[PDB]
Coordinates of C-alpha atoms in Angstrom, one line a residue:
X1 CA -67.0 58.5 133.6
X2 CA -67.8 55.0 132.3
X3 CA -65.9 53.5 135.3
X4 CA -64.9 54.3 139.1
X5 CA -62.1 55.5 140.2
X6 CA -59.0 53.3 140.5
X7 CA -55.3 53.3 140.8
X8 CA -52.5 51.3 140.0
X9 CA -49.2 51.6 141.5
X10 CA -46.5 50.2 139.2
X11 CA -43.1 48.8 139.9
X12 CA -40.8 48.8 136.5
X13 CA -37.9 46.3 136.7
X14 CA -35.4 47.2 134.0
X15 CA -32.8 44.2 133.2
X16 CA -28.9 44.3 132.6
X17 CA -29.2 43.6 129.0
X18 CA -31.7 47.0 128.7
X19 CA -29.2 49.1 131.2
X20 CA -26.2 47.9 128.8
X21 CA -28.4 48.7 125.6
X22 CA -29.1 52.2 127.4
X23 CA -25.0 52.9 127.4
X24 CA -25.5 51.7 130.9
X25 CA -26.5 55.2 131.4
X26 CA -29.0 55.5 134.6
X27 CA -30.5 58.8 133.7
X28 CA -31.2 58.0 130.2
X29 CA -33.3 54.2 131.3
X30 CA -35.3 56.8 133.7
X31 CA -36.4 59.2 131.6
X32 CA -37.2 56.8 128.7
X33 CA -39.2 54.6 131.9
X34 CA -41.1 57.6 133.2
X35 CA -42.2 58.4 129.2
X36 CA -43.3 54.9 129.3
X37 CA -45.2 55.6 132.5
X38 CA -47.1 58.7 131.1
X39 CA -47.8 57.3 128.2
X40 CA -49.7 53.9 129.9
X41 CA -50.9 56.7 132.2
X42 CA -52.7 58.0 129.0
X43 CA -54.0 54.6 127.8
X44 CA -55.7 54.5 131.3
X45 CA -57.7 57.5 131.1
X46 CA -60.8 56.5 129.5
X47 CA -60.6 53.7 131.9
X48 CA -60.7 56.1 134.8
X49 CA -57.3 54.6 136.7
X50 CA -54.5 56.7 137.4
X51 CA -51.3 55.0 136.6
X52 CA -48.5 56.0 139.2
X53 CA -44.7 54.4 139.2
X54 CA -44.0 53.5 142.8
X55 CA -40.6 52.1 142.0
X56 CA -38.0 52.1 139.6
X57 CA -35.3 49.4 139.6
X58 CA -32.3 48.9 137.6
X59 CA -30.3 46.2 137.5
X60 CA -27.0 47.7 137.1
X61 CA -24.9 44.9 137.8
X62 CA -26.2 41.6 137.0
X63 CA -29.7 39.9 136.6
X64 CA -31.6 38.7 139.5
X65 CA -33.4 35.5 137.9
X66 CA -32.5 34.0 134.5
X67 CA -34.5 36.4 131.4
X68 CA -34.5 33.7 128.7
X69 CA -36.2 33.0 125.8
X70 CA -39.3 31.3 127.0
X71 CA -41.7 34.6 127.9
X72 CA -44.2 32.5 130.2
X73 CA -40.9 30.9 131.9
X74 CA -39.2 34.4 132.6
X75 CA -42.8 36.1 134.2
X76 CA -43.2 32.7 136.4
X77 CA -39.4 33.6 138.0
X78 CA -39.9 37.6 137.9
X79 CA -43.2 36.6 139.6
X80 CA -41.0 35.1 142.3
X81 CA -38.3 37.4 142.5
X82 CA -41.3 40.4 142.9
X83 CA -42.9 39.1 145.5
X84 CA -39.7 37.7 147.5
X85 CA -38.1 40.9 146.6
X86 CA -39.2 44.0 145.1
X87 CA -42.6 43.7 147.2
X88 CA -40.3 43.7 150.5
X89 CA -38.6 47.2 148.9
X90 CA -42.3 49.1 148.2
X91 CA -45.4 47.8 148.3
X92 CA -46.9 48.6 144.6
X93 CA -49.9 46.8 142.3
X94 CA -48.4 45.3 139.3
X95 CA -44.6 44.9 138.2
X96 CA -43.2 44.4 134.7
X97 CA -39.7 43.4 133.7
X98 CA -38.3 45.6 130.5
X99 CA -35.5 43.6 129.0
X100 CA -34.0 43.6 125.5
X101 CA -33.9 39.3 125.2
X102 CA -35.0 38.0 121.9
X103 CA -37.7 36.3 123.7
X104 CA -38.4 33.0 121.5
X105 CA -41.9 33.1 119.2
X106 CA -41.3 36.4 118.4
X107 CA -42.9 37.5 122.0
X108 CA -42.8 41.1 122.9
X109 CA -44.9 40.8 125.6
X110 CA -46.6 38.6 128.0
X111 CA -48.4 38.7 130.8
X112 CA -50.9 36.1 133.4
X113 CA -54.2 37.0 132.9
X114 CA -56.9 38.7 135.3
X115 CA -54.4 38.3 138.0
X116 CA -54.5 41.9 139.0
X117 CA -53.0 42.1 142.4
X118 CA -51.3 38.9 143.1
X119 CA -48.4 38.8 145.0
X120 CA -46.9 36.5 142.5
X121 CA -49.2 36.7 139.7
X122 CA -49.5 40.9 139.1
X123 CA -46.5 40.6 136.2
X124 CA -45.9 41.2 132.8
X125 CA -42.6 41.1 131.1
X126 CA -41.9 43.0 127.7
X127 CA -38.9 43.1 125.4
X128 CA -38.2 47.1 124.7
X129 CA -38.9 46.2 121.0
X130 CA -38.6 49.7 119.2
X131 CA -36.9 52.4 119.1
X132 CA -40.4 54.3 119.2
X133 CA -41.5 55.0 122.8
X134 CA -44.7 54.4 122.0
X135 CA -44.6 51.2 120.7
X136 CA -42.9 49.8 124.1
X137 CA -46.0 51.7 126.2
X138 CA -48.5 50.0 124.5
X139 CA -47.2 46.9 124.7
X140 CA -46.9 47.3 128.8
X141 CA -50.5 49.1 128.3
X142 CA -51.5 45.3 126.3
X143 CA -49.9 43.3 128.9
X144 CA -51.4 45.5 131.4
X145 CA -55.0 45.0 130.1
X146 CA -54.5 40.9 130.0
X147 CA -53.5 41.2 134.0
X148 CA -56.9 42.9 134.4
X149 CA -59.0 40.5 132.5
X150 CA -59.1 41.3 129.5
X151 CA -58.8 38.9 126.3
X152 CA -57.8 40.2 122.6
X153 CA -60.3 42.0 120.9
X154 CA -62.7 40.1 118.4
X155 CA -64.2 41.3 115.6
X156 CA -67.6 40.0 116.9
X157 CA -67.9 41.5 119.7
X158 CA -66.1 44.7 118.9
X159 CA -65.2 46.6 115.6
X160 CA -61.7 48.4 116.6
X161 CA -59.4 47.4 114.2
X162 CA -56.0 48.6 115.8
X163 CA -57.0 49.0 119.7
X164 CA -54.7 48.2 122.5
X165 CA -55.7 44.8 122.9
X166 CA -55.8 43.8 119.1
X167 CA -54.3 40.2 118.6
X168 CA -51.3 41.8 116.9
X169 CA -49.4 45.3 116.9
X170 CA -49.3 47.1 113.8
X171 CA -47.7 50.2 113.0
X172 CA -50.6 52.3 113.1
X173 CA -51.4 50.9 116.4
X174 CA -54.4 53.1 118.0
X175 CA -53.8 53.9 122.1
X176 CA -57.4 53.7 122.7
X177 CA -59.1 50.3 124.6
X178 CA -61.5 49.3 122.3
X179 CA -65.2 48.5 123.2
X180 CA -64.5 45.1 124.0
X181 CA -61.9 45.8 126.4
X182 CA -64.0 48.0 128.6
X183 CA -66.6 45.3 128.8
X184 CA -63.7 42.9 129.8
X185 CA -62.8 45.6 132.5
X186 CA -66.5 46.1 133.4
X187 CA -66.4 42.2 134.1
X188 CA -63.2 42.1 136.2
X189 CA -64.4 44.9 138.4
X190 CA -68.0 42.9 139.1
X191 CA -66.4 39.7 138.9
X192 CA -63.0 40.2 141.0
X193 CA -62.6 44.2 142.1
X194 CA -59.2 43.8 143.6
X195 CA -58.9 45.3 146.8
X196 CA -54.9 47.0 145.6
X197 CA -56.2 49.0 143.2
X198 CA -58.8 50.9 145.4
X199 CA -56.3 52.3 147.2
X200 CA -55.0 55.8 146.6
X201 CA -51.5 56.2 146.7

């Protein structure tokens, strides 16, 4: 294996516009989460980190923090609310919000960068954009690969046209990292090495 062994715990947040999108139907948001799950699980392989989901919550009733339009303004108040909130529930590495908001700039996905770990800053929120499993994954997979350092692929440093961290999705998006995100990872575990994901579940 390229890389050591690590492992990231992940807490999935799914908002009441997704649950009422879902037919408010519990069952149906957890399978359709867990599929998510194995397929970032799959993403992770080559990178040698087992991707577990420590929690699962559904907001059922109402939303905890206002998911507007503004991408970078809804991860600053899920940061919050995770580690007020869901970190008090279950410890876990990184959250992400699911929500079906029309974030503005045509954003499906956002997420701080190299923040890995953070108690505020391990977030990512994404819009359930497609219909297509897949499509959703890898966008928590791209926002995902931004929280552990790594920066869209360039064709300069890296030839994979349709990798996970390619500046844009495409329909033929690829679920391998490309070259350039392994030497992002490579630098975020000599550089930072978080201390949460070296602990097995």
């Amino acid at each position: 294996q390229r890389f050591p062994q690590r492992y990231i715990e992940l807490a999935i947040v799914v908002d009441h516009g997704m649950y009422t999108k879902y037919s408010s139907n519990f069952k149906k948001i957890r399978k359709r989460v867990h599929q998510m799950v194995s397929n970032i699980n799959e993403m992770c392989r080559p990178l040698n980190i087992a991707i577990t989901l420590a929690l699962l919550d559904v907001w059922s009733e109402k939303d905890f923090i206002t998911v507007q339009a503004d991408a970078p303004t809804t991860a600053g108040l899920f940061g919050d609310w995770r580690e007020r909130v869901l970190l008090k529930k279950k410890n876990h590495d990184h959250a992400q919000l699911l929500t079906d908001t029309n974030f503005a700039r045509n954003t499906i996905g956002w997420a701080y960068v190299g923040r890995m770990c953070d108690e505020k800053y391990s977030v990512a929120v994404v819009k359930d954009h497609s219909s297509k499993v897949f499509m959703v994954a890898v966008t928590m997979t791209h926002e995902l690969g931004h929280n552990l350092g790594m920066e869209h692929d360039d064709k300069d440093k890296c030839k994979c046209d349709t990798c996970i961290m390619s500046a844009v999705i495409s329909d033929k998006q690829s679920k391998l990292f490309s070259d350039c995100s392994k030497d992002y990872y490579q630098t975020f575990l000599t550089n930072d090495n978080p201390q949460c994901i070296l602990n097995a579940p």
